[PDB]
Amino acid sequence: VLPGLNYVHSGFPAPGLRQINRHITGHDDNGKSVFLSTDHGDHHRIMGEKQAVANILYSTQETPVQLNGNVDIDKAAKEEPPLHYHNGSIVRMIDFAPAVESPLHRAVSIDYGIVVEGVFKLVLDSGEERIMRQGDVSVQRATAHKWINITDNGTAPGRMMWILLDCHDVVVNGQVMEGYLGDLEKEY
Amino acid sequence: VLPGLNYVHSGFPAPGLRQINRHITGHDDNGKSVFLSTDHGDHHRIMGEKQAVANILYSTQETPVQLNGNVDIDKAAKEEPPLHYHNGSIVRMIDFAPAVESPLHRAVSIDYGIVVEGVFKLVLDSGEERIMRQGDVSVQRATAHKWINITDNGTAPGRMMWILLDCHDVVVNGQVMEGYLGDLEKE
Amino acid sequence: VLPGLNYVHSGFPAPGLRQINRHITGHDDNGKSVFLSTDHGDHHRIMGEKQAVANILYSTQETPVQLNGNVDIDKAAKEEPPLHYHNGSIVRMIDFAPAVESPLHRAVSIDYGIVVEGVFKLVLDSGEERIMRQGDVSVQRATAHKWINITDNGTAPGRMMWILLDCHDVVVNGQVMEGYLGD
Amino acid sequence: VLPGLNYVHSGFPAPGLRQINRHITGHDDNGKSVFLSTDHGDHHRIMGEKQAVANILYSTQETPVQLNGNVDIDKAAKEEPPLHYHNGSIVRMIDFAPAVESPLHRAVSIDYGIVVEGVFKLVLDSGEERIMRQGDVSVQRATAHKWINITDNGTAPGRMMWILLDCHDVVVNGQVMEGYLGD
Amino acid sequence: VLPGLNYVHSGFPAPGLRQINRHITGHDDNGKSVFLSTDHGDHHRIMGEKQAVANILYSTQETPVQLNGNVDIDKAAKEEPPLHYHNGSIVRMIDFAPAVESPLHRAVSIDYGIVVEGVFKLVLDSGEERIMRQGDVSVQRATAHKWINITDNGTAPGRMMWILLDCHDVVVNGQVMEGYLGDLEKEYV
Amino acid sequence: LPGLNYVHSGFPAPGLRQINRHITGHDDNGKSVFLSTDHGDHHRIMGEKQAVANILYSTQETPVQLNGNVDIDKAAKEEPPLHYHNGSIVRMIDFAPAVESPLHRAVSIDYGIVVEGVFKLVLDSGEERIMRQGDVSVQRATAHKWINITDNGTAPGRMMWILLDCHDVVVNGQVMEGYLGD
Ligand SMILES: CCCCC/C=C/CCC1=C(CO)C(=O)C[C@H](O)C1
Ligand SMILES: CCCCC/C=C/CCC1=C(CO)C(=O)C[C@H](O)C1
Ligand SMILES: CCCCC/C=C/CCC1=C(CO)C(=O)C[C@H](O)C1
Ligand SMILES: CCCCC/C=C/CCC1=C(CO)C(=O)C[C@H](O)C1
Ligand SMILES: CCCCC/C=C/CCC1=C(CO)C(=O)C[C@H](O)C1
Ligand SMILES: CCCCC/C=C/CCC1=C(CO)C(=O)C[C@H](O)C1
């Protein structure tokens, strides 16, 4: 039984989760701060067999970010970003179908995760786990892990948001803790 | 009357909002990914006359982040960070007392904001405004703004979270959009 | 300023409201009861200046309903139904942007209404109103009314669902109380 | 042990579920649309061993509905409706005790079902199943099915509302698919 | 416009609020602890113009409480208690209609109050007030006050629960602060 | 061990809300005023940081003596015991996920209410009731156990009890002794 098979029938948002507002601010040609856009995000991507859907709220590709001439807006909207940006950031929102889990994987990045809706289980390759509820926050420091949606005993959708930042490779007594995607390669 | 006067009586979390779990992962001596800590955050800071309380969930001070030797954990924990870090990041969570307002201010940083609980109004120096509900997200590109907690017609606490990154100066018509701390009294 | 102007930026569902599952059941080759579809509904229509959006979950066009050959499914999906079907039914679900209100209007129709999310004010042409919270049910008997979304003091979206049934013209004191769209 | 045995101890609403407001509209002497009554429904019926309770919010016995002289109101109030009315409608709300389920059964009618509170499992005789959460909607086309309250892993009450309409009987392979009451 | 007029049309619970379970425990003749009842409370009383309904979850009439022969159970069930029992307790739960307000009154009693549902404003005769949300608790020490249901800008019902205990008369400057009920007097006659 | 080290910052437990406790009083002009707004009193970690209690008030005589604010002083000065003879205790407890109390009996009558979550109340006869938010229990000196079953043992829960003094429960000439249990 593939969990969440064909659950996400209408892209973002997944059934049972809320449509959002993303607001981007900026300056007009008089120097006044205004809103530039209100929308549903960007670069929506179905994951698995309609088991999840990702939503890229923003991205940057250099540090510090260049805002003049609105080049960061164009850069974020021009291309769908990869897993993570070197010297940059990605804000990726993913809706989980009931009981959907990620593969055990490692990205070489530092990730700030917050539970937007539902209950998620964060399982590391050691077997240690934490149950994260709405509002709880994780700082994933380039560790091998998998995310499991356990909301309402596996009957409810859930939503996570991650902010992915660039980090150097993790080295433990000579050896690189190399990145691997498992089955998440298909989505990127 | 000043809103939220003496409302936050026991730091974080503000009365009416939930205590949190912050989980930090890392590697043990065998290269296994483990949980290093589970706590309530860090560098709690009362704001105003007990009108709000901030919670620094993490911070970084270089790009890319250096993680080996747990150097990033030490830097985040040994100093209270400033408003924002150059070439770095700050995850700042803030509990608002009912009807509490930020000053009209500008930080020279790009901020990813999300409403964790409640309803907030984002007003910009042009007078343009958006009402942001739980789960809504704003991308603040070094703009002058204020945050207004309006939850339950101004009778309920609210919680925001921001991730502040470093950004270059914004130059409009050859003039720098200089950052400024506000003053609510003069408004 | 117009309430909820440009609020509904991505059709159904409105921002702050949940996507739905509509399940339609049927019969297979050997008479076993199965599921024929799971979807977001049908015939989504923006209303006003992106101030609301309707979703037609189902409709029938005769009484009693004819299910054989799945022709009822065909009738429901092949054309967008009108406001109200004669000798039939319409399941119309509508997401309201914050503080968006309906025009005072009358349809020759008996309406089963349920608040799916939010707080609504039902106002009749006499001035009488009832505030309806989530799960409350109204039976509109061809009366003239307007629906006002008041969720969270006019700052939150709301969702109503109606089932509209055909009724005979209502006569009060020898006068037929006529339908009107208002706007 | 029977699920939800004696759980419903004071009729409608079941413990843990909210009392409702049912509003009925009508016309007064001068043709003004007014509210006629606000109540808790009608024809409350305990089901099983106090394992559930049904609330009939409205019914009609003819299409189109006759509303003049409030005869539809008097008919809806005068007698407890049956499972479903020929050429008519029934608004039937039911509170489920924790873990309670219906018998596998078939009514020859087309039902619109919406989850009012809780989480329900809709199992068909083929074994196919869908989980329906709050606001999810089902169109039951005279199929054989079970309703199972699974709210909070079988420890919480749940509420469903159905609008049952008359339908012609479903014929498969030349065989009348006969409605049965199960248990 | 009188707030909450005719809102409570079916007693307890008020429309928009949940029906409750009240479990009472006891002993059988073998010393085993058993459940004696599960119900909707006791002594339901509509208040005002069907603007509120009260639900007496329990009461006691002596201290310490006598439980043998289940006599405490029968004393609580056989009679609707007054506002307050000398040397005893009352658990009073009250459903408010939208925007419904109690009169300014004083009970010579120490009351433990908890907001079960909604948002309430506790106003004392000094003009001071506190907004109490769900889970918030007050300890009312024979003070003059009123309760205001302000849930959802005055359009939603709310529920409070109180545990009233007996207290001595509060004297301030050799003058007893006398209890008074105002329009609440019609509700306990 | 359920909830081991879950309560990492005292009251409130992670996932549960901070409270306001308001105590009213009298002016020197006889005016009813607010004397304090706080987070309760006498917080106590229980188990291996598996639960935390919060004492909202307590009284030590019946009827209660409010003059001179002596009731406030007595409630604040010392942490109360399990229950007070001739008096009351308002005890709020946050439970970590899946945490259960021991099977035990106190010689008191307890008014319980679920503030948040889902709790199973188990009596020594094996009889149980699942109590949800808003449900109330009248514990008449019975041997019992409380189990936090919120969201299948994965969420915290909160109960509040008002404990009152009762006489010994004698069944067939034998006193039903209290015990703390294991
Ligand atoms: C097909 C089944 C799984 C689909 C959903 C996967 C989500 C979690 C994986 C993940 C992503 C997305 O690739 C990140 O962006 C980094 C973050 O830490 C974890
Ligand atoms: C006493 C009144 C002020 C307290 C209310 C909250 C203010 C939020 C201001 C803010 C901060 C904190 O300095 C940021 O980190 C950036 C973010 O956009 C707005
Ligand atoms: C842009 C502002 C107008 C749109 C807001 C929603 C209006 C609902 C009107 C309605 C319909 C749809 O036409 C029905 O299905 C009958 C039911 O009584 C009320
Ligand atoms: C003893 C426990 C079972 C009884 C409780 C609920 C059963 C609902 C069955 C049902 C009815 C009831 O008449 C309908 O009206 C059609 C609708 O599809 C399902
Ligand atoms: C019809 C207007 C009033 C309806 C709402 C009811 C409020 C009662 C307030 C109250 C009472 C009554 O005396 C108590 O039971 C003690 C406690 O302190 C507050
Ligand atoms: C092993 C970690 C702690 C387990 C959870 C604690 C339960 C509270 C026990 C209790 C008390 C205080 O001992 C009361 O106030 C009476 C009420 O019935 C149950």
| Most distant CA pair in chain C, distance | 58
Alpha-carbon distance of E128 to E21, in angstroms, equals: 35
To one decimal, the resolution in angstroms is 2.4
The CA–CA distances, whole Å, from C58 to A161, C22, C41, D144 equal 35, 9, 8, 20
Q: Hey, what amino acid is at D62?
A: E
| φ/ψ bin of A51: left (φ > 0), alpha (ψ from -120 to 50), beta (otherwise) | alpha
Alpha-carbon distance of A138 to B21, in angstroms, equals: 8
Asked if residue F12 is part of any domain, the answer here is no
C38 touches chain A (CB under 8 A): yes
Q: Which of chain F's residues have a Cβ under 8 Å away from the Cβ of D152?
A: 118, 151
- List the one residue out of D103, D101, D107 whose CA is nearest residue D143: D107
Structural domain of residue A115, as residue ranges? 22-167+178-187
Picking from D135, D139, D177, the nearest residue to C24 by CB comes out as D139
CB–CB of F151 and D152 under 8 A? yes
Q: Give the CA angle between residues F19, F21, F26 to the nearest 5°.
A: 160
CB–CB of A165 and B86 under 8 A? no
Asked if residue E10 is part of any domain, the answer here is no
Ligand 4: residue of D56, D94, D111 to mutate (most ligand atoms within 8 A of CB) is: D94
E94 touches chain B (CB under 8 A): no
* DSSP conformational letter for E44: -
Pairs across E and F, CB distance < 8 A: 230
> Into how many domains does chain D fold?
1
Query: String of b and e for C148-183 (b: at least 16 CB within 10 Å)?
Result: bbbbbbbbbbbbbbbbbbbbbebebeeeebebeeee
Torsion of CA A124, A127, A128, A132, to 10 degrees: 60
Q: Ligand nearest A2 Cα, by number? A: 1
Beta partners for D164?
D90, D111
Report the SS3 class of residue B12. Answer: coil
Query: Given the CA of residue D100, which atom of ligand 4 is nearest to it?
Result: 2
- List the one residue out of B89, B49, C150, F107 whose CA is nearest residue A139: B89
Q: Hey, what amino acid is at A21?
A: N
Q: Hey, what amino acid is at D36?
A: L
CB–CB of E16 and D17 under 8 A? no
Task: Extract long-range pairs of A125-130: CB within 8 Å, 24+ residues apart.
Answer: A125/B32, A125/B33, A126/B28, A126/B32, A126/B33, A126/B34, A128/B33, A128/B34, A128/B35, A130/B21, A130/B23, A130/B35, A130/B38
Sequence-ordered strand ranges (E) for E133-169: 137-141, 145-149, 158-166
A183 touches chain D (CB under 8 A): no
B60, A165 in Cβ contact below 8 A?
yes
Q: Domain with C86 in it: what CATH number?
A: 2.60.120.10
For chain D, the straight-line distance linking the first and the last C-alpha, in angstroms and rounded, comes to 17
- The total of other beta-carbon atoms located within 10 Å of residue B28's CB is 12
Which H helix or E strand runs over D13? Answer: none
Beta partners for D46?
D53
Asked if residue D121 is part of any domain, the answer here is yes
Q: Which of chain B's residues have a Cβ under 8 Å away from the Cβ of A159?
A: 135
Any contact of E with A, at least 3 CB pairs below 8 A? no
- List the one residue out of B88, B90, B79, B84 whose CA is nearest residue B61: B88
Asked if residue E2 is part of any domain, the answer here is no
For chain C, the straight-line distance linking the first and the last C-alpha, in angstroms and rounded, comes to 17
D6 touches chain F (CB under 8 A): no
- List the one residue out of A93, A103, A137 whose CA is nearest residue A123: A103
Task: Give me ligand 5 centre to Cα E184, in Å.
Answer: 7
* DSSP conformational letter for B97: P
> Residue F175's closest chain E neighbor by CA?
E31
F50, F2 in Cβ contact below 8 A?
yes
Report the SS3 class of residue B133. Answer: strand
F106, F112 in Cβ contact below 8 A?
no
CB–CB of C156 and B150 under 8 A? no
Burial class (CB in 10 A: 0-12, 13-18, 19+), C68: middle
Sequence-ordered strand ranges (E) for F63-173: 88-95, 108-116, 118-123, 128-132, 136-140, 144-148, 157-165, 170-171
Q: Which of chain A's residues have a Cβ under 8 Å away from the Cβ of D153?
A: 152-153
Q: Which of chain A's residues have a Cβ under 8 Å away from the Cβ of F97?
A: 131
R_g of chain E, CA atoms, integer Å: 17
Half-sphere exposure of A24 (CA within 13 A, CB side): 17
Task: Give me ligand 6 centre to Cα F53, in Å.
Answer: 8
CB–CB of F62 and E165 under 8 A? yes
Any contact of D with A, at least 3 CB pairs below 8 A? yes
Asked if residue D147 is part of any domain, the answer here is yes
Asked if residue F94 is part of any domain, the answer here is yes
Which chains neighbour A (Cβ–Cβ under 8 Å, 3 or more pairs)?
Answer: B, C, D, F
Any contact of B with D, at least 3 CB pairs below 8 A? no
Task: Give me ligand 6 centre to Cα F150, in Å.
Answer: 16
Asked if residue A73 is part of any domain, the answer here is yes
Size (chain B), residues: 187
E99 touches chain B (CB under 8 A): no
- The total of other beta-carbon atoms located within 10 Å of residue D1's CB is 4
Asked if residue C135 is part of any domain, the answer here is yes
Which chains neighbour B (Cβ–Cβ under 8 Å, 3 or more pairs)?
Answer: A, C, E, F
Query: DSSP string spanning C78-114?
Result: HS---S--TTSEEEEEEEEPTT-BPPPBB-SEEEEEE
Q: Ligand nearest F163 Cα, by number? A: 6
Alpha-carbon distance of D115 to E63, in angstroms, equals: 49
Alpha-carbon distance of F34 to F26, in angstroms, equals: 8
Picking from F8, F16, F19, the nearest residue to B15 by CB comes out as F19
A71 touches chain B (CB under 8 A): no
**Token pair belonging to D34:** 């007014």
Query: DSSP string spanning chain A?
Result: --TTTT---SSSSPBTSBB--EEEEEE-TTS-EEEEEEES-S--EEETTTTEEEEEEEEE-SSSB--GGGHHHHHHHHS---SS-TTSEEEEEEEEPTT-BPPSBB-SEEEEEEEEESEEEEEETTS-EEEEETT-EEEEES--EEEEE-HHHHTS-EEEEEEEEEBPPPEETTEE---B-TTGGGG-
